Protein backbone atom coordinates (compact mmCIF):
# COMPACT_ATOMS: atom_id res chain seq x y z
CA UNK A 1 0.00 0.00 0.00
CA UNK A 2 1.25 3.47 -0.89
CA UNK A 3 2.18 5.60 2.13
CA UNK A 4 2.43 9.40 2.13
CA UNK A 5 4.32 11.49 4.67
CA UNK A 6 2.57 14.56 6.03
CA UNK A 7 2.87 17.28 8.66
CA UNK A 8 -0.09 18.26 10.83
CA UNK A 9 0.71 21.27 12.97
CA UNK A 10 4.41 20.94 13.83
CA UNK A 11 4.24 17.14 14.03
CA UNK A 12 4.87 14.71 11.16
CA UNK A 13 3.32 11.31 10.45
CA UNK A 14 2.85 8.94 7.52
CA UNK A 15 -0.57 7.64 6.46
CA UNK A 16 -1.95 5.47 3.66
CA UNK A 17 -2.53 7.25 0.37
CA UNK A 18 -6.09 8.51 0.04
CA UNK A 19 -6.46 9.24 3.76
CA UNK A 20 -8.49 12.29 4.71
CA UNK A 21 -6.85 15.07 6.71
CA UNK A 22 -9.40 14.61 9.49
CA UNK A 23 -8.51 10.92 9.72
CA UNK A 24 -4.80 11.71 9.86
CA UNK A 25 -5.44 14.22 12.65
CA UNK A 26 -7.48 11.58 14.47
CA UNK A 27 -4.63 9.09 14.25
CA UNK A 28 -2.24 11.78 15.47
CA UNK A 29 -4.50 12.80 18.36
CA UNK A 30 -5.51 16.23 17.05
CA UNK A 31 -9.21 16.92 17.59
CA UNK A 32 -10.63 18.85 14.64
CA UNK A 33 -14.29 19.82 15.15
CA UNK A 34 -16.67 18.07 12.78
CA UNK A 35 -20.37 17.57 12.26
CA UNK A 36 -21.00 16.38 8.71
CA UNK A 37 -17.92 14.15 8.52
CA UNK A 38 -18.50 10.50 9.25
CA UNK A 39 -15.82 7.81 8.76
CA UNK A 40 -18.32 5.35 7.26
CA UNK A 41 -20.11 7.92 5.09
CA UNK A 42 -18.68 9.36 1.91
CA UNK A 43 -17.41 12.86 2.76
CA UNK A 44 -19.73 15.73 1.91
CA UNK A 45 -17.97 18.83 3.28
CA UNK A 46 -21.25 20.54 4.11
CA UNK A 47 -21.03 21.99 7.61
CA UNK A 48 -17.58 23.54 7.00
CA UNK A 49 -16.76 22.96 10.66
CA UNK A 50 -13.58 20.97 9.95
CA UNK A 51 -11.71 23.80 8.23
CA UNK A 52 -7.92 23.75 8.55
CA UNK A 53 -5.15 25.83 7.03
CA UNK A 54 -3.10 24.06 4.36
CA UNK A 55 0.15 25.53 3.06
CA UNK A 56 -0.26 26.61 -0.55
CA UNK A 57 -4.05 26.96 -0.30
CA UNK A 58 -5.59 30.42 -0.06
CA UNK A 59 -8.89 29.22 1.38
CA UNK A 60 -9.26 27.05 4.47
CA UNK A 61 -9.63 23.39 3.53
CA UNK A 62 -12.32 21.10 4.92
CA UNK A 63 -10.16 18.38 6.45
CA UNK A 64 -13.03 15.93 6.05
CA UNK A 65 -12.81 16.26 2.25
CA UNK A 66 -9.11 16.99 1.66
CA UNK A 67 -7.20 13.83 0.84
CA UNK A 68 -3.69 13.68 2.28
CA UNK A 69 -1.00 14.46 -0.27
CA UNK A 70 2.78 14.05 0.09
CA UNK A 71 4.73 16.86 1.76
CA UNK A 72 1.49 18.69 2.55
CA UNK A 73 1.67 21.05 5.53
CA UNK A 74 -1.48 21.45 7.63
CA UNK A 75 -2.08 23.68 10.64
CA UNK A 76 -5.22 23.12 12.69
CA UNK A 77 -6.93 25.48 15.12
CA UNK A 78 -4.25 24.49 17.64
CA UNK A 79 -1.46 26.12 15.61
CA UNK A 80 -3.15 28.47 13.11
CA UNK A 81 -5.06 31.59 14.09
CA UNK A 82 -6.84 31.68 10.73
CA UNK A 83 -8.05 28.09 11.13
CA UNK A 84 -9.26 28.78 14.67
CA UNK A 85 -11.09 31.91 13.55
CA UNK A 86 -12.76 30.00 10.71
CA UNK A 87 -13.84 27.15 12.98
CA UNK A 88 -15.19 29.45 15.68
CA UNK A 89 -17.07 31.55 13.13
CA UNK A 90 -18.60 28.39 11.70
CA UNK A 91 -19.59 27.35 15.22
CA UNK A 92 -21.19 30.74 15.89
CA UNK A 93 -23.14 30.52 12.65
CA UNK A 94 -24.12 26.99 13.65
CA UNK A 95 -25.50 28.20 16.98
CA UNK A 96 -27.34 31.41 16.03
CA UNK A 97 -30.48 29.58 14.92
CA UNK A 98 -30.14 26.69 17.37
CA UNK A 99 -32.89 26.35 20.00
CA UNK A 100 -32.19 27.01 23.67
CA UNK A 101 -33.33 23.44 24.27
CA UNK A 102 -30.33 21.83 25.98
CA UNK A 103 -32.20 21.15 29.25
CA UNK A 104 -35.08 19.53 27.37
CA UNK A 105 -33.02 18.03 24.54
CA UNK A 106 -32.53 14.27 24.71
CA UNK A 107 -29.06 14.64 23.21
CA UNK A 108 -28.03 16.89 26.10
CA UNK A 109 -24.86 15.64 27.73
CA UNK A 110 -24.23 13.42 24.73
CA UNK A 111 -24.40 16.22 22.16
CA UNK A 112 -21.44 16.70 19.81
CA UNK A 113 -22.69 20.24 19.24
CA UNK A 114 -22.49 21.07 22.95
CA UNK A 115 -19.01 19.59 23.27
CA UNK A 116 -17.61 21.19 20.13
CA UNK A 117 -19.19 24.54 20.99
CA UNK A 118 -17.46 24.36 24.36
CA UNK A 119 -14.12 23.40 22.82
CA UNK A 120 -14.36 25.52 19.65
CA UNK A 121 -17.11 28.10 20.23
CA UNK A 122 -17.50 31.63 21.49
CA UNK A 123 -18.24 31.95 25.22
CA UNK A 124 -21.36 34.08 24.61
CA UNK A 125 -23.74 34.96 21.80
CA UNK A 126 -23.50 37.89 19.43
CA UNK A 127 -26.87 36.98 17.90
CA UNK A 128 -29.53 39.40 19.14
CA UNK A 129 -31.94 38.83 16.24
CA UNK A 130 -34.88 36.42 15.80
CA UNK A 131 -34.12 32.72 15.61
CA UNK A 132 -35.43 30.55 12.82
CA UNK A 133 -38.23 28.31 14.05
CA UNK A 134 -40.10 25.15 13.05
CA UNK A 135 -42.95 23.18 14.61
CA UNK A 136 -41.30 20.63 16.88
CA UNK A 137 -41.19 17.68 17.20
CA UNK A 138 -42.58 16.02 14.06
CA UNK A 139 -42.70 12.26 13.65
CA UNK A 140 -41.08 10.88 10.51
CA UNK A 141 -41.98 7.34 11.62
CA UNK A 142 -43.49 5.44 14.53
CA UNK A 143 -40.05 5.47 16.16
CA UNK A 144 -38.19 8.64 15.17
CA UNK A 145 -39.08 12.19 16.14
CA UNK A 146 -37.52 15.07 14.23
CA UNK A 147 -36.73 18.50 15.71
CA UNK A 148 -35.82 20.56 12.66
CA UNK A 149 -34.70 23.57 14.69
CA UNK A 150 -31.88 21.62 16.33
CA UNK A 151 -30.90 20.19 12.94
CA UNK A 152 -27.51 21.46 11.81
CA UNK A 153 -28.25 20.10 8.31
CA UNK A 154 -25.11 17.97 8.42
CA UNK A 155 -26.94 15.49 6.17
CA UNK A 156 -25.50 12.56 8.11
CA UNK A 157 -28.98 11.07 8.47
CA UNK A 158 -29.79 11.45 4.78
CA UNK A 159 -26.34 10.32 3.69
CA UNK A 160 -26.76 7.21 5.84
CA UNK A 161 -30.26 6.51 4.54
CA UNK A 162 -28.88 6.71 0.99
CA UNK A 163 -25.35 5.25 1.05
CA UNK A 164 -25.33 2.77 3.94
CA UNK A 165 -28.98 1.72 3.87
CA UNK A 166 -30.64 1.94 0.48
CA UNK A 167 -33.72 3.58 2.01
CA UNK A 168 -33.69 7.26 1.03
CA UNK A 169 -37.12 7.98 2.51
CA UNK A 170 -35.73 11.11 4.19
CA UNK A 171 -33.99 13.84 2.25
CA UNK A 172 -33.03 17.47 2.57
CA UNK A 173 -35.94 19.60 1.43
CA UNK A 174 -36.78 23.24 0.85
CA UNK A 175 -33.87 25.60 0.22
CA UNK A 176 -31.62 27.99 2.08
CA UNK A 177 -32.33 28.68 5.73
CA UNK A 178 -35.64 26.86 5.26
CA UNK A 179 -33.83 23.65 4.31
CA UNK A 180 -34.83 20.72 6.50
CA UNK A 181 -34.59 16.96 6.67
CA UNK A 182 -38.00 15.58 5.83
CA UNK A 183 -40.13 12.81 4.39
CA UNK A 184 -42.06 15.03 1.97
CA UNK A 185 -45.55 13.70 2.69
CA UNK A 186 -47.35 11.24 4.96
CA UNK A 187 -45.12 8.42 3.70
Amino acid sequence: VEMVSLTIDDHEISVPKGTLLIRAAELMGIQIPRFCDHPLLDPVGACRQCLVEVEGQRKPMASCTTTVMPDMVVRTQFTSEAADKAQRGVMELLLINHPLDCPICDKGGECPLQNQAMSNGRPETRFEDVKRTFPKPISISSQVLLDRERCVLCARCTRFSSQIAGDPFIDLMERGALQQVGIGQDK
Binding site: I138, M173, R175, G182, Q185
Partner: protein, 233 residues
Amino acid sequence: LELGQRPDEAGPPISGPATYPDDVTESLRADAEQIIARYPDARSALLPLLHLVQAQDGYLTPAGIGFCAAQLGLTEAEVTAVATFYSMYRRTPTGDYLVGVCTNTLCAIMGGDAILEALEDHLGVHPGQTTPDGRVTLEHVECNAACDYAPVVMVNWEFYDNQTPSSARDLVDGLRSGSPPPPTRGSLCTFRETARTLAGLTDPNAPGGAPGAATLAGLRLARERGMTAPTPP
Protein backbone atom coordinates in the same frame (compact mmCIF):
# COMPACT_ATOMS: atom_id res chain seq x y z
CA LEU B 1 -49.30 9.80 14.14
CA GLU B 2 -49.35 13.09 12.21
CA LEU B 3 -46.32 12.26 10.09
CA GLY B 4 -44.40 14.85 8.12
CA GLN B 5 -44.54 18.62 8.09
CA ARG B 6 -47.46 20.38 9.72
CA PRO B 7 -49.87 21.77 7.09
CA ASP B 8 -49.76 25.27 8.62
CA GLU B 9 -45.99 25.56 8.13
CA ALA B 10 -44.13 28.32 6.31
CA GLY B 11 -43.37 27.67 2.67
CA PRO B 12 -46.53 25.64 2.24
CA PRO B 13 -45.57 21.96 2.23
CA ILE B 14 -46.72 19.84 -0.68
CA SER B 15 -50.43 19.19 -0.21
CA GLY B 16 -53.61 18.57 -2.15
CA PRO B 17 -55.03 15.56 -3.99
CA ALA B 18 -53.43 12.29 -2.95
CA THR B 19 -53.64 10.54 -6.32
CA TYR B 20 -54.62 11.16 -9.93
CA PRO B 21 -57.50 9.43 -11.73
CA ASP B 22 -56.74 6.68 -14.21
CA ASP B 23 -57.21 8.91 -17.26
CA VAL B 24 -55.02 11.67 -15.82
CA THR B 25 -52.27 9.15 -15.09
CA GLU B 26 -52.63 7.71 -18.59
CA SER B 27 -52.11 11.12 -20.21
CA LEU B 28 -49.30 11.94 -17.79
CA ARG B 29 -47.53 8.67 -18.59
CA ALA B 30 -47.98 9.32 -22.31
CA ASP B 31 -46.20 12.66 -21.92
CA ALA B 32 -43.64 11.29 -19.46
CA GLU B 33 -42.50 8.57 -21.86
CA GLN B 34 -41.61 11.28 -24.37
CA ILE B 35 -39.88 13.33 -21.67
CA ILE B 36 -37.83 10.35 -20.44
CA ALA B 37 -36.83 9.35 -23.96
CA ARG B 38 -34.70 12.48 -24.43
CA TYR B 39 -32.09 11.96 -21.69
CA PRO B 40 -29.21 9.49 -21.29
CA ASP B 41 -30.30 8.88 -17.68
CA ALA B 42 -33.97 8.63 -16.75
CA ARG B 43 -33.66 10.74 -13.60
CA SER B 44 -32.42 13.64 -15.72
CA ALA B 45 -36.08 14.17 -16.65
CA LEU B 46 -37.26 14.70 -13.06
CA LEU B 47 -37.33 18.49 -13.35
CA PRO B 48 -39.38 18.49 -16.59
CA LEU B 49 -41.72 15.88 -15.12
CA LEU B 50 -42.25 18.09 -12.07
CA HIS B 51 -43.18 20.81 -14.54
CA LEU B 52 -45.48 18.40 -16.37
CA VAL B 53 -47.41 17.52 -13.23
CA GLN B 54 -47.39 21.22 -12.34
CA ALA B 55 -49.39 21.64 -15.56
CA GLN B 56 -51.91 18.88 -14.79
CA ASP B 57 -52.73 20.72 -11.58
CA GLY B 58 -52.06 24.36 -10.86
CA TYR B 59 -49.29 23.42 -8.44
CA LEU B 60 -47.22 20.53 -7.16
CA THR B 61 -49.40 17.98 -5.38
CA PRO B 62 -48.71 14.69 -3.61
CA ALA B 63 -50.32 13.06 -6.64
CA GLY B 64 -47.74 14.66 -8.92
CA ILE B 65 -44.87 13.81 -6.58
CA GLY B 66 -46.04 10.21 -6.49
CA PHE B 67 -46.40 10.08 -10.26
CA CYS B 68 -42.86 11.36 -10.78
CA ALA B 69 -41.49 8.98 -8.14
CA ALA B 70 -43.19 6.00 -9.80
CA GLN B 71 -42.08 7.07 -13.28
CA LEU B 72 -38.43 7.54 -12.32
CA GLY B 73 -38.23 4.65 -9.86
CA LEU B 74 -37.47 7.16 -7.13
CA THR B 75 -39.17 7.26 -3.76
CA GLU B 76 -41.31 10.05 -2.47
CA ALA B 77 -39.11 12.28 -0.33
CA GLU B 78 -36.53 11.86 -3.06
CA VAL B 79 -38.72 13.57 -5.63
CA THR B 80 -39.88 15.94 -2.90
CA ALA B 81 -36.29 16.96 -2.17
CA VAL B 82 -35.85 18.16 -5.75
CA ALA B 83 -39.38 19.58 -5.97
CA THR B 84 -39.21 21.81 -2.89
CA PHE B 85 -35.75 23.03 -3.91
CA TYR B 86 -36.83 25.11 -6.92
CA SER B 87 -38.99 28.22 -6.76
CA MET B 88 -40.88 27.79 -10.04
CA TYR B 89 -42.48 24.68 -8.57
CA ARG B 90 -45.29 26.51 -6.80
CA ARG B 91 -46.94 24.76 -3.87
CA THR B 92 -50.40 26.38 -3.79
CA PRO B 93 -53.12 26.70 -6.44
CA THR B 94 -51.76 29.19 -8.95
CA GLY B 95 -54.09 31.50 -10.84
CA ASP B 96 -54.39 31.61 -14.60
CA TYR B 97 -51.55 34.16 -14.64
CA LEU B 98 -48.51 34.29 -12.36
CA VAL B 99 -47.61 37.98 -12.11
CA GLY B 100 -44.15 38.25 -10.57
CA VAL B 101 -42.66 41.68 -9.96
CA CYS B 102 -38.87 41.55 -10.03
CA THR B 103 -38.01 42.93 -6.59
CA ASN B 104 -34.27 42.33 -6.85
CA THR B 105 -31.98 45.19 -5.88
CA LEU B 106 -31.79 46.87 -9.28
CA CYS B 107 -35.40 46.40 -10.39
CA ALA B 108 -36.53 46.99 -6.80
CA ILE B 109 -34.98 50.43 -6.42
CA MET B 110 -35.55 51.32 -10.08
CA GLY B 111 -39.23 51.13 -9.12
CA GLY B 112 -39.87 47.44 -8.58
CA ASP B 113 -40.66 47.80 -4.89
CA ALA B 114 -43.17 50.52 -5.73
CA ILE B 115 -44.63 48.23 -8.39
CA LEU B 116 -45.07 45.42 -5.87
CA GLU B 117 -46.63 47.72 -3.28
CA ALA B 118 -49.02 49.16 -5.88
CA LEU B 119 -50.10 45.70 -7.02
CA GLU B 120 -50.56 44.55 -3.43
CA ASP B 121 -52.81 47.55 -2.76
CA HIS B 122 -54.63 47.13 -6.10
CA LEU B 123 -55.41 43.41 -6.04
CA GLY B 124 -55.60 43.51 -2.25
CA VAL B 125 -53.49 40.34 -2.29
CA HIS B 126 -50.09 39.65 -0.76
CA PRO B 127 -47.28 38.18 -2.87
CA GLY B 128 -47.60 34.42 -3.26
CA GLN B 129 -51.37 34.61 -2.83
CA THR B 130 -53.98 34.15 -5.55
CA THR B 131 -56.75 36.61 -6.34
CA PRO B 132 -60.28 35.55 -5.33
CA ASP B 133 -61.14 35.32 -9.04
CA GLY B 134 -58.34 32.77 -9.36
CA ARG B 135 -56.91 34.46 -12.46
CA VAL B 136 -53.88 36.31 -11.04
CA THR B 137 -51.33 35.12 -8.49
CA LEU B 138 -49.15 37.98 -7.27
CA GLU B 139 -45.54 37.15 -6.45
CA HIS B 140 -42.13 38.75 -6.18
CA VAL B 141 -39.29 37.32 -8.25
CA GLU B 142 -35.53 37.71 -7.97
CA CYS B 143 -33.41 39.05 -10.82
CA ASN B 144 -34.67 37.71 -14.15
CA ALA B 145 -31.76 38.81 -16.36
CA ALA B 146 -33.83 41.71 -17.70
CA CYS B 147 -32.17 44.40 -15.60
CA ASP B 148 -31.57 46.84 -18.45
CA TYR B 149 -35.37 46.82 -18.83
CA ALA B 150 -35.90 47.57 -15.14
CA PRO B 151 -38.46 47.66 -13.72
CA VAL B 152 -39.53 44.34 -15.25
CA VAL B 153 -42.70 42.39 -14.46
CA MET B 154 -43.12 38.77 -15.49
CA VAL B 155 -46.47 37.26 -16.45
CA ASN B 156 -46.20 33.48 -16.64
CA TRP B 157 -42.51 34.09 -17.29
CA GLU B 158 -43.12 36.47 -20.20
CA PHE B 159 -41.45 39.87 -19.93
CA TYR B 160 -43.07 43.26 -19.44
CA ASP B 161 -40.35 45.89 -19.57
CA ASN B 162 -40.13 49.39 -18.10
CA GLN B 163 -43.25 48.91 -15.99
CA THR B 164 -44.45 51.84 -13.89
CA PRO B 165 -46.99 51.49 -11.06
CA SER B 166 -49.80 52.76 -13.28
CA SER B 167 -48.65 50.52 -16.14
CA ALA B 168 -48.46 47.48 -13.87
CA ARG B 169 -51.85 48.26 -12.33
CA ASP B 170 -53.36 48.43 -15.82
CA LEU B 171 -51.60 45.18 -16.72
CA VAL B 172 -52.99 43.29 -13.73
CA ASP B 173 -56.44 44.77 -14.31
CA GLY B 174 -56.37 43.55 -17.90
CA LEU B 175 -55.13 40.11 -16.92
CA ARG B 176 -57.74 39.65 -14.20
CA SER B 177 -60.86 40.68 -16.11
CA GLY B 178 -60.37 40.58 -19.87
CA SER B 179 -57.75 41.00 -22.57
CA PRO B 180 -54.18 40.33 -21.40
CA PRO B 181 -51.92 43.16 -22.59
CA PRO B 182 -49.22 41.71 -24.86
CA PRO B 183 -45.83 41.12 -23.24
CA THR B 184 -43.11 43.49 -24.35
CA ARG B 185 -40.94 40.43 -25.08
CA GLY B 186 -42.82 37.13 -25.25
CA SER B 187 -46.21 35.63 -26.06
CA LEU B 188 -48.46 35.43 -23.02
CA CYS B 189 -50.26 32.18 -22.22
CA THR B 190 -51.93 30.52 -19.25
CA PHE B 191 -49.87 29.14 -16.38
CA ARG B 192 -50.65 25.57 -17.42
CA GLU B 193 -49.42 26.29 -20.95
CA THR B 194 -46.13 27.64 -19.59
CA ALA B 195 -45.79 24.63 -17.29
CA ARG B 196 -46.20 22.32 -20.28
CA THR B 197 -43.73 24.42 -22.27
CA LEU B 198 -41.10 24.09 -19.54
CA ALA B 199 -41.59 20.34 -19.88
CA GLY B 200 -40.64 20.76 -23.54
CA LEU B 201 -44.04 19.57 -24.80
CA THR B 202 -45.20 22.85 -26.39
CA ASP B 203 -44.58 24.16 -29.89
CA PRO B 204 -41.46 26.38 -29.72
CA ASN B 205 -42.57 28.59 -32.64
CA ALA B 206 -44.43 31.11 -30.48
CA PRO B 207 -44.86 34.70 -31.71
CA GLY B 208 -43.41 37.84 -30.21
CA GLY B 209 -39.99 38.52 -28.79
CA ALA B 210 -38.81 41.66 -30.58
CA PRO B 211 -35.33 42.79 -29.46
CA GLY B 212 -36.62 45.90 -27.70
CA ALA B 213 -34.96 49.23 -26.97
CA ALA B 214 -32.42 48.18 -24.34
CA THR B 215 -31.12 45.15 -26.24
CA LEU B 216 -30.52 47.37 -29.26
CA ALA B 217 -29.11 50.34 -27.32
CA GLY B 218 -25.50 49.37 -28.01
CA LEU B 219 -26.00 48.63 -31.70
CA ARG B 220 -28.03 51.81 -32.17
CA LEU B 221 -25.28 53.85 -30.52
CA ALA B 222 -22.64 52.17 -32.69
CA ARG B 223 -24.57 53.00 -35.86
CA GLU B 224 -25.49 56.55 -34.82
CA ARG B 225 -21.80 57.16 -34.11
CA GLY B 226 -20.72 55.37 -37.29
CA MET B 227 -18.42 53.31 -35.11
CA THR B 228 -16.24 50.67 -36.76
CA ALA B 229 -18.30 47.56 -36.06
CA PRO B 230 -15.13 45.55 -35.19
CA THR B 231 -11.78 44.74 -36.82
CA PRO B 232 -12.34 43.34 -40.36
CA PRO B 233 -9.72 40.54 -40.87
